[PDB]
């Protein structure tokens, strides 16, 4: 399925610190953030997505349209400018963020009835699983 709507609560998190390190996130921020459970809220209507990543320590919101490139500031993550594009490869939603970092973006799919996320930067991959309603 391509339908990713829901409130998604983290069940599993692997190599989140490696991913943050590859983004050069400072030591203090990484050490706190790696401890935390996360929620991902996805509102999806056709190509239009509104996504909210939250924990006790951050809020990172982004809206995008599948197939439409957008210039993006990554704000309180790593304060960088990238050129972002989100597209479908089958039922895997793929984001590529062009800029300073290589292999930066994510892949997201519903293989379960859970949400799977791969966050990538450089040679680092973080893998997460969330459970929905
Ligand atoms: C569709 C999935 C998106 C937009 C994201 C998944 C995780 C994200 C994220 C994780 C961690 C942070 N910080 C500030 C540690 C920000 C965003 S966005």
Author numbering: 1 to 133
Provide passages from the article that reported this PDB entry.
Human cellular retinol binding protein II (hCRBPII) was used as a protein engineering platform to rationally regulate absorptive and emissive properties of a covalently bound fluorogenic dye. We demonstrate the binding of a thio-dapoxyl analog via formation of a protonated imine between an active site lysine residue and the chromophore’s aldehyde. Previously, we showed the utility of human cellular retinol-binding protein II (hCRBPII) mutants as a fluorophoric tag, wherein an active site lysine residue (Q108K) reacts with synthetic aldehydic chromophores, giving rise to the formation of either an imine (Schiff base, SB) or an iminium (protonated SB, PSB).
A conserved water network connecting the hydroxyl group of Tyr19 and the thiophene sulfur atom of TD-1V was observed in the M11 crystal structure. This observation marked Tyr19 as a residue for exchange into one that could disrupt this organized water network. Although incorporation of the Y19W mutation with R58H did not alter the spectroscopic characteristics of the protein/fluorophore complex (M13), surprisingly, when coupled with R58W, it led to a 30 and 22 nm red-shift in absorption and emission, respectively (M11 vs M14). Gratifyingly, the crystal structure of M14/TD-1V was obtained and showed that substitution of tryptophan for Tyr19 did indeed disrupt the water network observed in the M11/TD-1V crystal structure. The explanation for why only the combination of Y19W with R58W led to the significant change in spectral shift as opposed to the combination of R58H and Y19W is probably due to the nearly 90° rotation of the chromophore trajectory enforced by its interaction with Trp58 for M11. Exactly the same orientation is seen in the M14/TD-1V crystal structure, confirming the key and exclusive role Trp58 plays in causing the rotation of TD-1V in the binding pocket. For example, neither R58W nor Y19W are individual “winners”, but together they lead to a substantial effect. With the changes thus far, M14/TD-1V complex exhibits a bathochromic shift in absorption and emission (Δabs = 73 nm, Δem = 45 nm) relative to its parent mutant complex (M1/TD-1V).
